[model samples]
Target: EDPEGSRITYVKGDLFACPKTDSLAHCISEDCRMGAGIAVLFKKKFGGVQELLNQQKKSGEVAVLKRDGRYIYYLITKKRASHKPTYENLQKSLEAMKSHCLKNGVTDLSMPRIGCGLDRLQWENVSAMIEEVFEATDIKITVYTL
Candidate 1:
């Protein structure tokens, strides 16, 4: 029952949830390819298993994978509901990502329309979240949808 009415195909009961940072060395899944891809990407960014969980625990984000020479990062934050991006959480997640990137010497990266889609977030609402984070950091960013 493709209730979303879009080209993207999602699985039933596969509602959004965060996967642990150490599980990135695997194939992409049928339901959430983006998250799967991100996981694979994280493995490429961090060299070994010892650093994976520690990196995420220290920074609260995961450097999932490196593609086209750019690192992809994922933030571990409390999901926000209410049809809008919460500045508090978004800022914290952004800080987490930025801190990790800076510590790891990462430059260019890609981000997703984080709170949209299944989160039922408006683009305007999510855009503000991106702007808020990007404004404080200098890394070149490419935003995309899953």
Candidate 2:
């Protein structure tokens, strides 16, 4: 259970890839996996987004995949009820993304306003979280929210 009644609780036994539903709350899904799109590399024939999905499936990670032109961004998390997208988890995920982007020589990228939608976070707050990680870094991040 989450200390904050508004946050979703990350728990064990939940499949990494599963549709989430709830009552009395809005729900949305977010993925942060590799190969769900074209942004990441595939040095071998079997090393594409499908490969990542397979790996995550075998590892019990959720199936998070999306596409933006040649870029393939994976949905890291699906419809969740927890409202707690804490600073530490966000930082770790961002760092992982940055490492991937840098490894692929990507200097510019875009993403949705994570944590602000179902997570009920504000843009300023989310930006601040991102800024904390991108401070003095060269990667330019574009965040879109509706």
Candidate 3:
């Protein structure tokens, strides 16, 4: 099943098109209200993400906010439309997510090509960072591409 590696797997489907039971849906977000790309999909699926962003005032950051049936993990991959994706922030976010997963007993994670969509980062680099942060653990990351 994991032909790519131990940490990352590539799947052909929508990022939001996964089993919603006990799984964490992940996405790359920004610090502003411009939820344009996949963030829009997340907002549509889980409206509280936008509320959390507005209320927490923790843009350009990472968070694992709770939802109805699952959790939504947000990595502030960009600051604005013109700004490029920050790999450092992405790495830090992944690190935080790794810890959170371990502490919260989360095993299954589903996400899109993080930072590669509206954030304009390369999947190769992003995947590598993900592996670096999570390969040693038991977390399974399914990266969906639509």
Candidate 4:
């Protein structure tokens, strides 16, 4: 994924192929049982299982990691990885990540279709939620899909 001048750029490829200057984000449960999907790649690349665990974030919150030159976001929106997540919690997690982004001057943000993957949340709703949550920010969101 790569940033575009537009507000949101949809790209087709691996999420990790993005530039290091752009931050990455994805959904996860409070359990942080990142044993599958892109979450597994994040765990391997960033290797911050303990560091993220240390933050002890709850559902509807975000746990962050600074690697290379970008921020890696683990959005917690469910209690257990095996359980489905609610859109309400997804919005809350996005909002939480928003605050962190604005505070840390994160302008280029890259992520998957987020909750639409293993969590099975609708991208139609999730995309609009992200648009709504970040409507007033200066961030340029880059969405990656397989």
The root-mean-square deviation over C-alpha atoms between each candidate and the true structure, in angstroms, is 11.9, 14.5, 3.1, 3.4
* lDDT by residue for model 4 (1-146), tens: 85435667899998899887999999898888899888888988888888888899999999999998779999999999899999999889989999999999898899998888678888888888888999878898999988
Give the runs in model 2 whose Cα sits over 4 Å from its true position. 1-52, 57-70, 75-84
Q: Stretches of candidate 1 above 4 Å error?
A: 1-70, 79-87
Error of 3 at 24 (Å): 3.6
Q: Of the candidates numbered 1 and 4, which has the greater lDDT value?
A: 4
For model 2, what is the error of residue 62's alpha carbon versus the real structure, in angstroms, after optimal superposition? 11
The C-alpha TM-scores of every prediction are 0.47, 0.49, 0.82, 0.93
Clashes found in each candidate (C-alpha, N, C closer than 3 A): 4, 20, 0, 0
Better of 1 and 4 by TM-score: 4
On lDDT, who's better, 2 or 3?
3
Which predicted model would earn the best TM-score? 4
lDDT of each: 0.42, 0.39, 0.70, 0.89
Error of 2 at 94 (Å): 0.7
Candidate 2 residues 44-143, lDDT tens each? 2113444444534311122323222223333233323233455455555555555555565555554555556545557677577667766655665544
Preferred candidate (TM-score higher): 1 or 3: 3
| C-alpha RMSD in Å of predicted model 3 compared with the true structure | 3.1
